[PDB]
Amino acid sequence: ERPTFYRQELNKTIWEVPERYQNLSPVGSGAYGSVCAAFDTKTGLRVAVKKLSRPFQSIIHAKRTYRELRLLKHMKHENVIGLLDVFTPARSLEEFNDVYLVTHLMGADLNNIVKCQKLTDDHVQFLIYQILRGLKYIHSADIIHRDLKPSNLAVNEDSELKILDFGLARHTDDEMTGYVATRWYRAPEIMLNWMHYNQTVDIWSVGCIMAELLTGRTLFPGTDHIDQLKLILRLVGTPGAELLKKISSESARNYIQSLTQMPKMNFANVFIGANPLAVDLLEKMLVLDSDKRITAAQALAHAYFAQYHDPDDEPVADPYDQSFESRDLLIDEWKSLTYDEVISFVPPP
């Protein structure tokens, strides 16, 4: 029951896909692969078809391909991007070389929509609510997004939102250098590798996003890692003795101690005119000590979301086994694992 594939030269490369996918139009390409928008005749949906580039060129890339596939296959939630289809023109493992991932084509991201723009409080409540709803689900599976930012949040005409572009491969040092949005939303503990981070880094990101939706401005637009740290400490105050101890690196800890101490600012005087409940939530999310930040599940129960919160309609995820992350395998082994995941894929209802 293998579909019939047809070939077409797109993105300077040959694309071989099932007949169901029509009107392929290149819309982007990265170091990870090329993407084409298409019309899926089987579902009637507009979709993004991503052809990975040399998915098995090294152990690192092979494991990354496997990682991304396992992750997309697991995500089954309204506010998270899921996998509509995955296919390969290969008819056997020996012939297996290419991987195509198919997902919902999302109109645009939060970035290309609210850029230099301030949204109403009701609008912010709905958007942040959906992000936290997707995040409760994600974290419940012990998965950390690690790269939440406006450009990784898709929204349709009805303001329905989906989280995407999970952190699969560590960004390059150059990618996080300077006045770049790629770093403005990162929690300080991970921006400067202070300690073994956890799911709480994602809540810091939500806080930065939320503040930007409310003000129309980037909360911490640092020109470099240090400038950014100063912008952050200026708002939330410098680390106390309790947090200092939790910082593994002696170097980091030592640099921190060189800074003049500063008290946490009054957020009501920072986010002027903002809903007091919004201010309160921001203070709970933008906490320097990650151990003390509010969790997604806790945040959903915060009064700011009274209008949308429904404890019976904020599902958690099935257990997600990521023991493979510690597996030491050869390229071909990662490739065979990916192959099994491709052929065992079951279309969503």
What residues line the site for Mg ion (CB under 5 A)?
Answer: 151-152, 165
Q: Is 237 labelled as part of a ligand binding site?
A: no
Nearer to Mg ion, 165 or 341 (CB): 165
Nearer to Mg ion, 84 or 148 (CB): 148
Nearest to 172 by CA among 31, 277, 304: 31
Q: Is 49 labelled as part of a ligand binding site?
A: no
**Active-site residue, 310 included:** no
- In whole angstroms, the minimum distance from the beta carbon of 29 to Mg ion comes to 13
With beta carbons less than 8 A apart as the criterion, state whether 202 and 144 touch: yes
Nearer to Mg ion, 11 or 151 (CB): 151
Phi, psi of 285 (to 5 degrees): -90, -40
Other Cβ atoms within 10 Å of 325 Cβ, number: 10
Annotated catalytic residue within 40, 85, 122, 165 = 165
Q: Is 27 labelled as part of a ligand binding site?
A: yes
Of all residues in the shown chain, the one whose CB is closest to Mg ion is 165
SS3 164: coil
- 31-57 burial code (b ≥16 CB/10 A, e <16): ebbbbbebbbeeeeeebbbbbbbebbe
Q: Is 28 labelled as part of a ligand binding site?
A: yes
Q: Is 76 labelled as part of a ligand binding site?
A: no
- In whole angstroms, the minimum distance from the beta carbon of 179 to Mg ion comes to 18
Measured in whole angstroms, the distance separating CA 78 from the mean position of its chain's CA atoms is 15
Dihedral angle, C-alpha 252, 254, 256, 257, nearest 10 °: 170
Nearer to Mg ion, 165 or 283 (CB): 165
- In whole angstroms, the minimum distance from the beta carbon of 313 to Mg ion comes to 7
With beta carbons less than 8 A apart as the criterion, state whether 128 and 206 touch: yes
Catalytic positions, written as ranges: 165
Query: Which residues belong to the annotated binding site for ATP?
Result: 27-35, 50
